[PDB]
Ligand binder design. Sequence first.
Ligand SMILES: OC[C@H]1O[C@@H](O[C@H]2[C@H](O)[C@@H](O)[C@H](O)O[C@@H]2CO)[C@H](O)[C@@H](O)[C@@H]1O
Length: 318
Amino acid sequence: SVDLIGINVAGAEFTGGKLPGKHGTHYFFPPEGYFEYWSEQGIHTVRFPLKWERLQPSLNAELDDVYASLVDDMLDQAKENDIKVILDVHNYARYRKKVIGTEDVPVSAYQDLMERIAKRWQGHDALFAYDIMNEPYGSADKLWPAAAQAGIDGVRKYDKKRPLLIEGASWSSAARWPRYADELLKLKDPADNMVFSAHVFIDEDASGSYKKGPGKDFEPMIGVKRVEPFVNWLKEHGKKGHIGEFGIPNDDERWLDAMDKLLAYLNENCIPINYWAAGPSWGNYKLSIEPKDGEKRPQVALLKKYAAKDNCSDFGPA
Ligand SMILES: OC[C@H]1O[C@@H](O[C@H]2[C@H](O)[C@@H](O)[C@H](O)O[C@@H]2CO)[C@H](O)[C@@H](O)[C@@H]1O
């Protein structure tokens, strides 16, 4: 099913500078019992970041069985708790700091990664979709459309049914989406099941740092206004959409009001959201909705409120 309400469960992509790194020290998968809390809160879809270099420490070669087995176990526990998972290659269109499409990371190497991801997990009932790359940016922007096509071709060799979540240039900015997304119109999916996925924060520079508070003259519809360029481009071109990353601090009611207004707008257009972020090792991270003693998480009640209003059967907009 297409749930409008989902969460990011981050941690497996942490500490990108430590490769391969050590599980429990540099990166973190959900412990056993982790998904139980979110299942009882009525959350049934999870977006799960992964690091390409840990999945595949050598281009064009087999996946690392140790890290991939941690993914196996995660998907099993999601199935235990009635959760479907979006796998997210959280790599900014780069492998070991080099852009997909340059000499050292040819698009064929990216295609090989996605072939291997799809081959290993297409048979897993808990797998919902592939977010084939998180936030292309910078020098990756011009090369990203060609990379995306190779990623699509790779998955479709082994999985011809699941949705493919296609992010855009410029950190997949929702507010800036129409400036660059026309180049994504050339993408071809034999299965005709692509969904575009933009990201939005409502701080000053949309970086999600929230260095400052809402400030005076704060516009509660700011979240709606920053996703309107994305949703209107989807309507103009007859495409389907998704918001794969959005989060707010827990310390100002004005943030919550804007998140309510955003979720209402997304509901009216059948656009799913993945809140950024839950996860087992976030510590004091200001956007975390993971339960923490000496923290309250008023974003969760808002998510649950709109999960009960979800009467969409497919990705919108209409
Ligand atoms: O949006 C999350 C993403 O933002 C990056 O900051 C961008 C920002 O998105 C953009 O709106 C602004 O104009 O430029 C900055 C970059 O200088 C940030 O670098 C990422 O870590 C983050 O994932």
